C-alpha cells in the first residue's frame, strides 16, 4: 500500500475492507453543521515529563517515538474518558503548500497536519487499544505556511539522517509542548487510523487553531524518500488520505 497511482488510497479497500467502513477518517469539518456541545470539558495536555527516544522513516512518514511505559506525557479531559498515553507523533504533507492536511475545514486544505497519537491505559498496551472503539485519541493540528516555528527546528535538522525507509536516529529530550497552538479549542468525532489497517478505534481531536511554519521548514519535509536506500528515488510528498463520508456521525465543537 502507498500513495502512488497503483497503491494509493483508492486501492486500500482490497487488502483493508474496513476502508469503506462506517467511521473512517479523515473527514471535512463543516463548521456550520458541527454542533457546539456545552458538555465538553477542556483538553488536558500534560507533556512536561515527556521522554522522546527516536525518529524513524517508516516508508510513509516519519514517527517521533516516546517512552510510554509510564504516564509521562498524557492527554485527558475533553470528550475523553480515562488517561491516554502519548506513543508517537507524525505528519502528513503535500508536494505544494496548497495541500497536505488530511482533515479539511469547510473544504480548506492546509500545508500539513500533525498527529499526536495516544492510547488508553485501561487496555494495557497499544496493541490491545487498537482493538477497542475508545482505544485511541489523536490530537490533530494543522500547519499553515508563514513564520517559522522554533520548536519544530530540531525535528527538521535530523531529517537528513533518516532520508530513506528503515532509517532511524536517537532523538531524546524533544519537547512536544513546542508544537501546540495557543488555543486548545477543538472539534471532536469518532473516526479511524488514516493509514492501513484503518482500525476504527479513534476519538479525533482536531485543533481549531493552526500553527505556522516557514516555507523552508516544510521544504525539508519534501526531501524525504518513500524508498529504501539503494532504490530509485521517490520523494515522500502527498502522503495524505482524501476525505471520507461522515455517514450520520456528528462533529461537535468545544466553542
Ligand atoms: Zn496521521
Curated annotation (Swiss-Prot):
Effect of residue 113 to Q: Strongly reduced activity and sulfonamide affinity
Enzyme class of the recorded protein, top EC level: lyase
Regulation of catalytic or functional activity: Activated by X-ray, histamine, L-adrenaline, L- and D-phenylalanine, L- and D-histidine, L-His-OMe and beta-Ala-His (carnosine).
Residues the record marks as site: Fine-tunes the proton-transfer properties of H-64: 3, 58, 63
Coiled coil (residue ranges): none
Effect caused by changing residue 102 to A/Q: Strongly reduced CO(2) hydrase activity
InterPro entries: CA_dom (IPR001148), CA_dom_sf (IPR036398), Carbonic_anhydrase_a-class (IPR023561), Carbonic_anhydrase_a-class_CS (IPR018338)
Pfam entry (one): Carb_anhydrase
Subcellular location: Cytoplasm; Cell membrane
Active site: 60
Phenotypic consequence of residue 58 to D: Strongly reduced activity
Effect ascribed to mutating residue 61 to S: 2-fold decrease in enzyme efficiency, as determined by kcat/KM ratio, and efficiently inhibited by chlorzolamide
Amino-acid positions noted as binding substrate in the UniProt annotation, renumbered to this chain: 194-195
UniProt effect for mutating residue 138 to H: Impaired activity
EC number: 4.2.1.1, 4.2.1.69
Resulting phenotype, residue 58 to V: Reduced activity
GO molecular function: arylesterase activity; carbonate dehydratase activity; cyanamide hydratase activity; zinc ion binding
GO CC terms in record: apical part of cell; cytoplasm; cytosol; extracellular exosome; myelin sheath; plasma membrane
Illness association: Osteopetrosis, autosomal recessive 3: A rare genetic disease characterized by abnormally dense bone, due to defective resorption of immature bone. Osteopetrosis occurs in two forms: a severe autosomal recessive form occurring in utero, infancy, or childhood, and a benign autosomal dominant form occurring in adolescence or adulthood. Recessive osteopetrosis commonly manifests in early infancy with macrocephaly, feeding difficulties, evolving blindness and deafness, bone marrow failure, severe anemia, and hepatosplenomegaly.
PANTHER family xrefs: CARBONIC ANHYDRASE, CARBONIC ANHYDRASE 2
UniProt similarity note: Belongs to the alpha-carbonic anhydrase family.
Record-given protein name: Carbonic anhydrase 2
